[model samples]
Target: MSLRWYPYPEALALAQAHGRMVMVYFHSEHCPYCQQMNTFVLSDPGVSRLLEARFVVASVSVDTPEGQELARRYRVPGTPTFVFLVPKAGAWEEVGRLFGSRPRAEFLKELRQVCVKGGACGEGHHHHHH
Candidate 1:
């Protein structure tokens, strides 16, 4: 199934309700590099699968008023930003952030790192015991 990509605020609420983190895509409609992320790594079916399995996702356009507000709050200098927020200490906390576009593998790797950082994976203690 494809990602729902709820609005930023809605995604935050959904993430709280679902006990998951929020993945916000801050991008520009006219940005060339943002287009690469819009249609490249994010378009990969594997990426879609990973997104579906975890996190509530949102796509925000920096051109919009709400987007500008969020960008300022997040201190994003430019477009094509990925912000991962995990609910912790009864509030949403920033766990991972990425700027610009990356290859599919690298992007996936970063996402998994976010998962681990945010404790999204099960049972903790990731160390493999022999």
Candidate 2:
């Protein structure tokens, strides 16, 4: 399936209904780095699969009215800003944020560590139990 695009209204509604965190990516058409994210980071099969299961992904253009409002509210200063929000007691709370792009593996790793595990994997923390 193709990546989902959610305008402001629909994106808010879905987030409310599912109570799942939303990964809001602010992008501009003229940005090469944003294009790279669209073509590479977000489109990577592994990242896509992980994101599909964990959160609702939304891409909004900085030029649109709705997008502009959200960008201002979120204080997004540049294209390709990622903000992760989760529903908390009927309101959305920003849990994590990142800017720019990284390679697929590193991007996915950081995303899981922050978006899923809350923030960073923590220091000196090992994953294996046995």
Candidate 3:
């Protein structure tokens, strides 16, 4: 399976709708490591499946003004940055961040453990209080 990506705003909206999280991959087209991750880790079948099922994935290129603004707001330090966000109180809240390329197994392990508040994990949300 292939990974699907949305615009940052669109992914945020979808996350809100599905009560899921957003995984934003910030990359620069000219960065070799970005291409490395794109070709290796991000392309793995398990990674694709998990990402598609668990989160609204967005590929943000820091090559344009829109992406630069997002990168600035998110405090993106460099290429191949991953920022995870959960929908919260009518907005998106950053919950986790990962830098650089990862092995498929390593990335998959991270994804499995990337729990979001609320029911965003799609399971283990049986406990709650007012």
Candidate 4:
């Protein structure tokens, strides 16, 4: 499945409209780990289908103006940060976060825990195994 990624505001709107969560993929153009995630984890069929079905996805480049502001708002320290947020009362509330690249299976598991089960599994857990 081809994941259609939106901008931050558009994604938020779509999430609110669809009653789905927002999954923001924060990356830098030069980060190899981010490329690995785009190629390996996100490209996996299971992960792609799950995200496309359950979340309003957004891809933000930390180097851009809007992305830099968002990074500062979210306190993201580096590239390849996956932040899951929910629309709450008139704002977006971050529910979970994952840092760096993960294997396809582990990434899908994390997505299931955070997005499907509505659990807070990714907040303090930043690393995963292959």
Residue-wise lDDT of candidate 3 within 47-130, one digit each (tens)? Answer: 888887868888788878878898778777667888888776776666667777777777776677675333454444587675
The lDDT of each candidate is: 0.80, 0.70, 0.75, 0.78
CA lDDT for candidate 4 = 0.78
Instruction: At residue 117, give the lDDT of candidate 2.
Output: 47
Worst lDDT 10-window in candidate 4: 116-125
Better of 1 and 3 by TM-score: 1
Please provide, for model 4 over 1-130, each residue's C-alpha lDDT reduced to its tens digit, 9 standing for 90 to 100: 3886898888888999988889988888766677767786688878888888878888888889898898788888666789988775676677678886777777777788766544452344676674
Superposed model 4: Cα runs more than 4 Å off: 117-130
- For residues 1-130, what per-residue lDDT tens digits would candidate 1 score against the true structure? 4786888988998888888778998887655577767676788888877778778988787778888898788877556789988876587777778886777788889888887877663444677765
In the range 19-61, model 2's lDDT, one tens digit per residue, is: 6557788888755676767686679878877777757778788
Q: What TM-scores do the predictions have? A: 0.85, 0.78, 0.80, 0.82
Best by lDDT: 1
Cα RMSD of all models vs. native, in order, equals 4.3, 5.0, 5.0, 5.4
Error of 2 at 105 (Å): 2.5
TM-score of 1: 0.85
Clashing pairs in 3: none
